Amino acid sequence: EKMNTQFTAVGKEFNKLERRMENLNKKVDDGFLDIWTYNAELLVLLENERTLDFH
Amino acid sequence: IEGGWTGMVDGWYGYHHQNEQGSGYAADQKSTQNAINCITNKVNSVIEKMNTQFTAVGKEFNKLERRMENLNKKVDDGFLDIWTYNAELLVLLENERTLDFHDSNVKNLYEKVKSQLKNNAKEIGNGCFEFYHKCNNECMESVKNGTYDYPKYSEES
Amino acid sequence: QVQLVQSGAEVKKPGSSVKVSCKASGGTFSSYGISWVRQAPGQGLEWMGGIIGMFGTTNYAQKFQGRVTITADEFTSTAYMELSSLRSEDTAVYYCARGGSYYVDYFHHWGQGTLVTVSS
Amino acid sequence: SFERFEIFPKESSWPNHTVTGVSASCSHNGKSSFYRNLLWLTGKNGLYPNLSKSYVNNKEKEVLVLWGVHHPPNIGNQRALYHTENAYVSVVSSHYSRRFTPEIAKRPKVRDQEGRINYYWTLLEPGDTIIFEANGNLIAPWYAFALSRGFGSGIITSNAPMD
Amino acid sequence: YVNNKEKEVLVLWGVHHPPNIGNQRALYHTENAYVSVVSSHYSRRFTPEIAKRPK
Numbered sequence A: 001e002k003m004n005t006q007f008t009a010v011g012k013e014f015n016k017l018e019r020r021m022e023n024l025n026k027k028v029d030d031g032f033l034d035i036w037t038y039n040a041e042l043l044v045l046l047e048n049e050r051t052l053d054f055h
Numbered sequence B: 001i002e003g004g005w006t007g008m009v010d011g012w013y014g015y016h017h018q019n020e021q022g023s024g025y026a027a028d029q030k031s032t033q034n035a036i037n038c039i040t041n042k043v044n045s046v047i048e049k050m051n052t053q054f055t056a057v058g059k060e061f062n063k064l065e066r067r068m069e070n071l072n073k074k075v076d077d078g079f080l081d082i083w084t085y086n087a088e089l090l091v092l093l094e095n096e097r098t099l100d101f102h103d104s105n106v107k108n109l110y111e112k113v114k115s116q117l118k119n120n121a122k123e124i125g126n127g128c129f130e131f132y133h134k135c136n137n138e139c140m141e142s143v144k145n146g147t148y149d150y151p152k153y154s155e156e157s
Numbered sequence C: 001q002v003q004l005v006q007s008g009a010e011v012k013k014p015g016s017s018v019k020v021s022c023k024a025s026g027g028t029f030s031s032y033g034i035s036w037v038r039q040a041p042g043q044g045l046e047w048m049g050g051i052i053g054m055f056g057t058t059n060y061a062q063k064f065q066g067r068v069t070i071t072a073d074e075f076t077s078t079a080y081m082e083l084s085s086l087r088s089e090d091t092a093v094y095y096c097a098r099g100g101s102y103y104v105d106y107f108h109h110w111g112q113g114t115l116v117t118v119s120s
Numbered sequence D: 001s002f003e004r005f006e007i008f009p010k011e012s013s014w015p016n017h018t019v020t021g022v023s024a025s026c027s028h029n030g031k032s033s034f035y036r037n038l039l040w041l042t043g044k045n046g047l048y049p050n051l052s053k054s055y056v057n058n059k060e061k062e063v064l065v066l067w068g069v070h071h072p073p074n075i076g077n078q079r080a081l082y083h084t085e086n087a088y089v090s091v092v093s094s095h096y097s098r099r100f101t102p103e104i105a106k107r108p109k110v111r112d113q114e115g116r117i118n119y120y121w122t123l124l125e126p127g128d129t130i131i132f133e134a135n136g137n138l139i140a141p142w143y144a145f146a147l148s149r150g151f152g153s154g155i156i157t158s159n160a161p162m163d
Numbered sequence E: 001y002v003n004n005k006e007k008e009v010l011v012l013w014g015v016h017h018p019p020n021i022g023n024q025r026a027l028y029h030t031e032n033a034y035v036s037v038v039s040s041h042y043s044r045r046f047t048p049e050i051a052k053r054p055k
């Protein structure tokens, strides 16, 4: 439930003179993927330990 | 331990007695006060980490800058989703520890009484003990606080 | 280190109610007990009542028992007053005190105090 | 989705201008052809009278309009096509306006062509009007794509087979 | 204008685009007109775009 997934992820493209847009846009996409990957693993790894101790 | 109390006040953890000297609930100040310190430090830590000093005024873009609006919109939405997840996860995770934290304290206090309250008192299971020796307030408060006089009493032994 | 700060001095007409707010420097979440005390001009102090930590249990002396109400917003580490039915005898100084523990035991932290007088 | 329609009918829109667009680079079926939505204007009988046509959006949906400006390589093609050394094309609307000029100059060969044609686009709000003005070097619209918005759609780059 | 102050100053100017020649000549008596605004780190030249427009 916490991990929502309803959003738009279609990529964009920029011309040659807008290299700043592409680098800035690329960072935004990469930044979130790194964050979500860390959040997904940390929550799953942390919860597993509690469950094993819970039993 | 099996079932809470309502008459008791001024303490999360407390004892009870039924001696002829007087029946009434009491609180363990040392145990309760220690627990409060962790709660106060725990809640303070959450607030301190969650900084809130920043600029959030929105911007607007013309019709030909649709790329800016979508990119700017994603940045705003992305952070809100992240903070919402982080806020709930930290709060939900901390609550579980606090609930378990109290159980250890009360259970730890119960075991501490057992060590100080040797076999002279019969344990009936439901978070209570039956004494083989008649005790007055002087001895009753001995068990409640950190001083006891076990060698004095050896009745039925 | 912590500091106790109270509101400024105030003067009220007889038969009115006076409210004084006590706050602690860096007033983050706190659970220390609070109380109040009156120091009449040229006379000794006398206890009023206080709060007990998270439990929010209030006790007041039998002298009034209905005229003073104390509630503490623990999140802001603030203690309020709702004294009512002031009279000439009530002209004195009110101080905010803490005991260092959730209970209402002895006090070892004091504020700067507040002087409140009643007259027309 | 679109609602494609003929904004400027060929038969009646341009009775005083040659409308047969010929280009080798845009050949179709191994023969001369040109874009299907645009239109290449040219002066017949040596005359290119000023064309002043406007369109009114009698719809509740935004309409996409396309037009192009010709950039002949040399003077020879410029005079033989519009008979005016100095030409201008103007497109105006309620909330849009700009004036173009033909940039005549030799360019490196691309697709075995010397000149260039620059394309432009704009969106007309419902109940809005657009006025087309020019006296040479114009690629007038022939079709427009009235569009309706829809959530969830997007553009993707893929090559997997359909099914 | 010379900015004899220690604070940045915002300057505004506009260029007229008369609809037809009649209003152009009757207002400035010059068929071809230009307006130029230059500064230490700013410069550009405008021209009037005379043409009929929707009301």
Ligand SMILES: *[C@@H]1O[C@H](CO)[C@@H](O[C@@H]2O[C@H](CO)[C@@H](O[C@@H]3O[C@H](CO)[C@@H](O)[C@H](O)[C@@H]3O)[C@H](O)[C@H]2NC(C)=O)[C@H](O)[C@H]1NC(C)=O
Pocket (backbone or CB within 6 Å): B137, B138, B139, B141, B142, B145, B146, B147
């Ligand atoms: C834990 O609780 C017990 C019971 O309340 C405390 O026992 C108290 O011990 C003191 C000794 O320092 C007693 O004081 C002495 O009492 C005798 C009685 O005759 C008197 O003659 C002396 O002059 C002196 O006052 C005290 O009476 C006794 N409590 C009771 C109720 O009798 C014990 O001190 C507590 N320990 C801690 C660490 O809290």
Ligand SMILES: *[C@@H]1O[C@H](CO)[C@@H](O)[C@H](O)[C@H]1NC(C)=O
Pocket (backbone or CB within 6 Å): D015, D016
């Ligand atoms: C085309 O030319 C004729 C005369 O040659 C003129 O009457 C007509 O108005 C022109 N077309 C339009 C759309 O006005």
Ligand SMILES: *[C@@H]1O[C@H](CO)[C@@H](O)[C@H](O)[C@H]1NC(C)=O
Pocket (backbone or CB within 6 Å): D049, D050, D135
């Ligand atoms: C086209 O515009 C020019 C520029 O004013 C004008 O001289 C010419 O007469 C116009 N053409 C016609 C057919 O009116």
